[PDB]
């Protein structure tokens, strides 16, 4: 019934990009510097290779002295793991974003887990690529069986110890001369796939 898409499936790519941007467009407080996010198939291959390990833990080669993508020094990563029937790109990314309920923007205090949310709305991250793997078992879950294991990687990586974006009037601190589209800074060069 539920299809787990491959990393080149055009609808899968559209869903990942559109749904990330919708959350980035709609943040509160408004963001002055939120970059428009596009797909990167090299990031999706990286996510594919790591998701294939079926581990609920970060790719060990996201930071120096590794360099998996030739254009980013450090990569970010969000992981979602759950049942095949419940999986969709929309449900997984929304589950990441909804950690906002536990994040206090003013103080950066997180009541539980907030680093999926912060990476979704990380202003400086502008490339994403994702993959979902079918996993008979996922390490780090004992009960789960025959699950969907969905990984997105982000370039450049976010989740530095600072606010995920610069709060301010939308698009008021875009790079260089960038124009604004739905509250996002766009740039023909960055945005090409």
Swiss-Prot record:
According to PubMed:8973356, it is ubiquitously expressed with high levels in lung and kidney and low levels in heart and liver. Highly expressed in cell lines derived from nervous system tumors arising from glia, low or absent in non-glial-derived nervous system tumor cell lines. Also found in fetal kidney. According to PubMed:7607567 it is expressed only in brain tumor glioblastoma multiforme/astrocytoma and not in other nervous system tumors or normal fetal or adult tissues. GO terms for cellular component: azurophil granule membrane; extracellular space; membrane; plasma membrane. One of its GO terms (biological process) is sexual reproduction. It is a single-pass membrane protein. Keywords: Membrane, Signal, Transmembrane, Transmembrane helix. Its main location: membrane. Residues 17-154 form the SCP domain. It is found in: Membrane. Belongs to the CRISP family. This is Glioma pathogenesis-related protein 1.
